[PDB]
Amino acid sequence: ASPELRQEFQQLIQEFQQLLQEIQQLIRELLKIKLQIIKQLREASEKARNPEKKSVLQKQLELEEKQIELLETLQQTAQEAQQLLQELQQTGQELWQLGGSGGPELRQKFQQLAQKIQQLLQKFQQLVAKQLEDEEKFIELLETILGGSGGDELRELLKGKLQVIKQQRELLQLVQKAQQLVQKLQQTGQKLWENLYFQ
Ligand SMILES: [K+]
Secondary structure (H helix, E strand, C coil): CCHHHHHHHHHHHHHHHHHHHHHHHHHHHHHHHHHHHHHHHHHHHHHCCCHHHHHHHHHHHHHHHHHHHHHHHHHHHHHHHHHHHHHHHHHHHHHHHHHHHCCHHHHHHHHHHHHHHHHHHHHHHHHHHHHHHHHHHHHHHHHCCCCCCCHHHHHHHHHHHHHHHHHHHHHHHHHHHHHHHHHHHHHHHHHHHHHHHCC
């Protein structure tokens, strides 16, 4: 490896490390607003005089607790990715330290780690995409029961849900950026082990 290739690899590891930190911070912010919204849903549900409005709010309250638990799963997934990323860094380091003394075992380990990270991010994207769909569905339902009795708290609940959706789309974009970095690391990886094919 040239200094330029080592630096290219190290820059991608650092960018990805910073991205996973940004993802963990955004999940923490999502958990905070979503727990605040659970309390708003419970309050609105307790106050609701119209049985059809109580019914809608109560059944969404049950789904909300499940969505909170999924976000905590995403925190653990992001942590596992951070651990795999350090192991990928160590495998990259093996490639430039050993250079021509490297063997296929280095490439195999590197590709196994990069594929595990890719699989974690694909699972991550699917779970965020699904939660986003469920948020969009609840908003379409919530819109039908605005005004009349509960009007004020239901409008505040809708404003909250619209902010939640903005943050979940922001989180999807970060996971999509992470999948770009996996491909760049695989491209830089190939440059690190390429010489081993032609000895
Ligand atoms: K060799």
